[PDB]
Ligand binder design. Structure first.
Ligand SMILES: O=P(O)(O)OC[C@H]1O[C@](O)(CO)[C@@H](O)[C@@H]1O
Ligand SMILES: O=P(O)(O)OC[C@H]1O[C@](O)(CO)[C@@H](O)[C@@H]1O
Ligand SMILES: [Mn+2]
Ligand SMILES: [Mn+2]
Ligand SMILES: [Mn+2]
Ligand SMILES: [Mn+2]
Ligand SMILES: [Mn+2]
Ligand SMILES: [Mn+2]
Lengths: 252, 252
């Protein structure tokens, strides 16, 4: 499998999930269908999303790691799947939630070759490959502002911070693409409970990187060895190469 | 002018303001075009919307306290209008921004008789009149949440908090409606500099209170004497009656 193949499968997935959720009225979406592989309720809308995805997906030679259903298959391309990040927002009709996909030639983030984040609410498509990061077919890169007086996404502000704006939309993959686009100058999930999972962060991280962003663990450690088919925890510090050290200092 | 008048007015403007915005490129939107009378830059998205609304409100016997051109007219019916609330989103394509209209029978908030917040991205319509509060013509009401461990929207988390979640979507007018319909447990703006202005909060407050919420200033004192002028600013604490006293001791 290559990137184009990856781009082709993701768009196919994007359309199906898009359709399944779009149909489901809020009061259906909100219902607990079961206990997720993640340890949190699997709501009716996450069930349809993950279903749609997994039907296109498992016709591939992939080992998939998905939010609700765990580790699936044994193929040697790993897919970090988030069938619907922003669940809370979709169950109440707030237009920020996506399907996020990250393909790797190993069970390690450092071998990622393709990243994909589709805005299920607005139909906004992001992805990055060996040619660059994109939004709705147009190239994108991170902003170049290096003052901490900036536009930050942040989970969570523990204290008084210097930011210009602080925002929390509730969708780690999409917010990372909000960082990738330059819409926001940084992204931070610095909660001492390292709560992010590999599939919520996988592609946005990848994509954040092709658009120029520097992205690391809390202490600036590399995200290269974060694993898939293991239950990985992530904290993220993501900014251009310039603001990046200052943030690192800022929370230290 | 009647509660039934105010809604038809509000509806004209939302549709005109929605066409106007939807047809501007993000490129053309984020462009500064002047100093608003509120002390911030007017962006092109801001005046396009404002001109389109004002174009209609000018037919009515009112005084408008509007963000970009300030207070225009001498009618007896007062209208607070944020032409565009969430401009930063709007100029990013983040789909959370609205037109806000609050109509009062006088200068003060206590005389409000109608509230209207319309999401210009989604089409969602939030209004309230004597008949209560609505979301797209469906009766709404706030959360029943009695627990401080809840889903909060707050500006700005500066300390270690016990909410089950925290969110900040960038449009308080809109976010006041997410609490109004019970999509969130509480809205809090507690920024010490008291940032909010009347057109930010008046319609969201009126909608939420009609939805059964207790909405007050930072102390717990009512907002009834908040002024429909440009100098007015405020802090906000929003929750159901049981929860509301709780956040007051919390934020103490
Ligand atoms: O992961 P937490 O603890 O919910 O923090 C918020 C994040 O949760 C995620 O759903 C990840 O599971 C993100 O979409 C959201 O932005
Ligand atoms: O940009 P800030 O400082 O985060 O303030 C956010 C506020 O912006 C407003 O548009 C008012 O300026 C509100 O809708 C939102 O609640
Ligand atoms: Mn889950
Ligand atoms: Mn999810
Ligand atoms: Mn997720
Ligand atoms: Mn302004
Ligand atoms: Mn505005
Ligand atoms: Mn505003």
């Amino acid at each position: 499998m290559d990137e184009r193949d990856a781009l082709r499968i993701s768009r196919e997935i994007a359309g199906e999930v898009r359709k399944a959720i779009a149909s489901m009225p809020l009061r259906e979406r909100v219902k607990d269908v079961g206990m997720g592989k993640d340890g949190t309720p699997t709501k009716a809308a996450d069930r349809v999303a993950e279903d749609a995805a997994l039907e296109i997906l498992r016709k591939e030679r992939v080992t998939v790691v998905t939010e609700e259903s765990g580790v699936l298959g044994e193929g040697d391309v790993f897919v970090a799947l988030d069938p619907l990040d922003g669940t809370f927002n979709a169950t109440r009709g707030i237009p920020v939630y996506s399907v996020s996909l990250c393909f790797s030639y190993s069970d390690k983030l450092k071998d990622a070759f393709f990243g994909y984040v589709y805005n299920l609410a607005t139909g906004d498509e992001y992805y990055a490959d060996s040619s660059g990061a994109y939004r709705n077919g147009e190239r994108i890169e991170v902003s170049d502002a290096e003052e901490l007086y900036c536009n930050a996404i942040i989970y969570y502000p523990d204290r008084k911070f210097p930011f210009k704006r602080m925002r929390i939309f509730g969708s780690a993959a999409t917010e990372l693409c909000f960082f990738a686009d330059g819409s926001f100058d940084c992204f931070l999930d610095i909660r001492p409970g390292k709560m992010l999972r590999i599939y919520d962060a996988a592609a946005g991280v990848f994509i954040a990187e092709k658009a120029g962003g520097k992205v690391t663990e809390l202490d600036g450690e590399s995200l290269g060895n974060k694993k898939f088919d293991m239950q990985e925890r992530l904290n993220i510090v993501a900014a251009n190469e310039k603001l990046h050290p200052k943030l690192l200092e800022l929370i230290k």
